[PDB]
Curated annotation (Swiss-Prot), chain I:
The organism of origin for this protein: Poliovirus type 1 (strain Mahoney)
Parent-protein start and end of this portion: 74 to 341 of 2209
Role played: Forms an icosahedral capsid of pseudo T=3 symmetry with capsid proteins VP1 and VP3. The capsid is 300 Angstroms in diameter, composed of 60 copies of each capsid protein and enclosing the viral positive strand RNA genome.
Subunit structure and binding partners: Interacts with capsid protein VP1 and capsid protein VP3 in the mature capsid.
Name of the protein: Capsid protein VP2
Cellular compartment(s): Virion; Host cytoplasm
Amino acid sequence: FCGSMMATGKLLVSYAPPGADPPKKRKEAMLGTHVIWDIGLQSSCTMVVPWISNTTYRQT
Amino acid sequence: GLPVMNTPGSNQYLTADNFQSPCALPEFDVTPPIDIPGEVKNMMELAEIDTMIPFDLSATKKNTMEMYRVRLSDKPHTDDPILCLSLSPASDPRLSHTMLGEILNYYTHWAGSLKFTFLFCGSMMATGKLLVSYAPPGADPPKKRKEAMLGTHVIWDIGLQSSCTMVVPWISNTTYRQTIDDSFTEGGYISVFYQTRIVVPLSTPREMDILGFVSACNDFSVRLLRDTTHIEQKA
Amino acid sequence: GLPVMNTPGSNQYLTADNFQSPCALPEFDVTPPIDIPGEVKNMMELAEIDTMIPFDLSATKKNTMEMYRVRLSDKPHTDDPILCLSLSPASDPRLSHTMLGEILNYYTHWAGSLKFTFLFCGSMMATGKLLVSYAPPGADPPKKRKEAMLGTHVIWDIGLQSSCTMVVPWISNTTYRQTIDDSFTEGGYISVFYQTRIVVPLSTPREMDILGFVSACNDFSVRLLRDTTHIEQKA
Amino acid sequence: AAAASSST
Amino acid sequence: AAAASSST
Amino acid sequence: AAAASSST
Amino acid sequence: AAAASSST
Amino acid sequence: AAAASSST
Amino acid sequence: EACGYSDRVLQLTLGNSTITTQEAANSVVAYGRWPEYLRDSEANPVDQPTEPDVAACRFYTLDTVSWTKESRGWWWKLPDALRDMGLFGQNMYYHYLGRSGYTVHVQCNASKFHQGALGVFAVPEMCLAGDSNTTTMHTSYQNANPGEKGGTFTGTFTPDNNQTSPARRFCPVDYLLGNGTLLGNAFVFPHQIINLRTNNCATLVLPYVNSLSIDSMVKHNNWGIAILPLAPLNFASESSPEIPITLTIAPMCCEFNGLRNITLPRLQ
Amino acid sequence: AATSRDALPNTEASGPTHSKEIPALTAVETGA
Amino acid sequence: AATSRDALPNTEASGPTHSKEIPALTAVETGA
Amino acid sequence: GAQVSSQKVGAHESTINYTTINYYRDSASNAASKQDFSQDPSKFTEPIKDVLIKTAPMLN
Amino acid sequence: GAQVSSQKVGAHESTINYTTINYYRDSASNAASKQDFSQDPSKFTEPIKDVLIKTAPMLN
Ligand SMILES: *C(=O)CCCCCCCCCCCCC
Ligand SMILES: *C(=O)CCCCCCCCCCCCC
């Protein structure tokens, strides 16, 4: 987050494994893998996208 | 005399009390017991015995021998119910006068698992598969095999072992249910269906009867003794 | 029979008595307890919990959410009171309906130390120092910081720790006080003042609220159980 | 007590 | 007393 | 009890 | 008696 | 009983 | 902590969901009891329970509501507010019986120049009062269970009078906690306060509470979540400030008994 | 030795089955 | 001692969390 | 001659006891003890000459 | 089966006792003993996940 120190906010970062309608609304996005990021002193937030695959390797 | 102070309850007569009292025939020579067969120690022993369910209380069949017979036939497969029953062992008209139902009407509360056994009374040449279901309360009461299938059930295959038992497991929110029709303590739905169909050869009867029995499991109990509504003395 | 002599009190019914009596449902199968969360053993446990004081029972504010809010402002220093309160935990209108006040109206007598906690609900940019006072009874009730200062007090500095607690120590002639307005067992005066003043920067609200809570200390007790006046059944 | 009470 | 008084 | 019962 | 009469 | 019956 | 750690900064993870907060005021565990599964000694239904675990015991975010100078308060019931939430709602409607605990995370951030205080209360058996003065205990199931969107408090009791065709709904006056008791005493219930100068979230861990080990989740709500403005929203000098409040809730140690066909409730 | 007020039997945990034991099938003609 | 063809680290099982350890929050300004 | 027995305690406020003394010579005067025994239903539920094993075919 | 306990003596004229005997089989018939236990209010007054030290900052 590169806003000012006086700016606050909560954001949600999502990952949805394939196979359904790609999320277009927080409601859908919420149902999969996610992190609710709270903006504050720790400037940054990390979301891990876990290896979730049918195949052992994916194509590039 | 010893100083005493009468407390409340004094001189009253509680019909459920348990005190001593003077004997009117002192030193009476009591006739001893002999060892009569068939002694009972608890009313629940009687509830554990199978008794026949009057499934068909339809207007022309009720209060007659016909009420005990569920007629089946070799007709083509259908997903419609052979019979539907509410699990209200004391209040449902079909269970209320069975020995289990009768004992339950002397008590306010019941709890435990029940078991329904069905007997096929068709000919040896008749075959068939039926499905016996129990649906815990709270959804649409089953009207089609498809719904009924989703709950507790047994697929009965007709053969040498004449009969089949389905256990209705104790599944309740409350620790005890009431012996009356009551939504808060509703028990669910029993229903029977054709899995495949009854099949007979030629020269064989195409219709036949099944009979049903209910009894209590060893985990069944009752409490709060009460008067029954199954007898009265109008005047 | 054993010679006995009935003493006075015989056949009476004291509602506070403690005797045995015959059971109307013998051998009833009692449903066991489960471990429900939140068990209480003594009513004083509830008195030790903080509940919000309706400080402003002014005519337009009473019986509304506003009664709980003590409004402050960034106005210049004054030695005049923000609020004044009598230490009559059961009878003063501001304390009488708090959970402490409510429990106290089921008892005739109280004793122990109390504690008032105040919460500042202004913005983080607002600063200020306030003085919270307790004056034991017997003199002119404080109307100016100068008087209030001379008794038991706490100077509260507003900052990260949002709230401040002042303890009102048990200071009494009698061993217990009455749960009613009464001069012989009067408890004194609680009052709040501005030590310096509330200061805000620009672009900041100049008025804000504080909230107050009361709870009992571990040395607090009550006695002589009685009916409350906080409920009735006219007809 | 022994004595407590006589018994029969 | 010992005997108690029977106990169950 | 022995003493507690005095007896006569 | 000893046993039970319990005492507290 | 011994104890519990206190005596004075 | 000399190596960094603090009361105000938490990370909660349940299932595939993680919440972070840098401005908490600790966490509350209701009555000091952490959610748990039903013990054999306390068990009642004899059938093998369904335990959805990560599929249902994760964080569901409900619809964000908006706090303003005129807001009087909001309420929700559990499990009702989660009845349509993914695999939790499905397991709920397929079974006769169910039990669950919850982690409730209320989210409301603002700025160093705003002010205001929200009281967040978890009430066991939160029976609310109806809108009628001619009949009692008459709010309809549909009106009593708003689902995820919840309901709201009013500052004024205004009695439904259409006697011919009654509203049949709650009329919860804020200073009476919608139930005839004074709001100032709701602090005897498990709670937290979101005071904008101090914190931006409230976190409550709620055990399963009831007079039964397990019950009908469709018929009965175990907990009520009540959020009321203890001190009104205020900012700089704007007469109409607004800030969002978001509710995220996670079922915890939830288990279900009595499987059958799905319950299709008439909710309108 | 079992008394009228002793607790009833505990339910025991049981899992899936695929065997020749047939508890469910019986013959009431026997009188049992 | 780790060679280019050694297998990579195993994923370890991990459960629910409610604590003050904050893996997810960081500050990339540090250069890490 | 006092008889001490224990109560099966329902809702609680060690084992609790109660005391009984018979005042009359005739046992018919005695109250009911309620200290009763249970039996198993076999003689009614399974009166068959050959013992039944529930997992095996009732008829073989 | 008698039960002997001591009275917490208020205004005085060794420990003084009183005696109780249960006459009924059902524990519901029993009087109330009033021999009750106290608990500490923690679960209501301090339901917080992290133990609080009163001399230290509630928030740190
Ligand atoms: C066994 O009973 C020895 C202890 C006796 C205890 C006192 C009995 C109380 C009075 C009983 C008198 C009997 C009346 C027929
Ligand atoms: C334990 O109780 C042994 C001592 C008995 C003392 C005498 C009891 C007084 C009469 C009690 C009769 C009980 C009435 C149901």
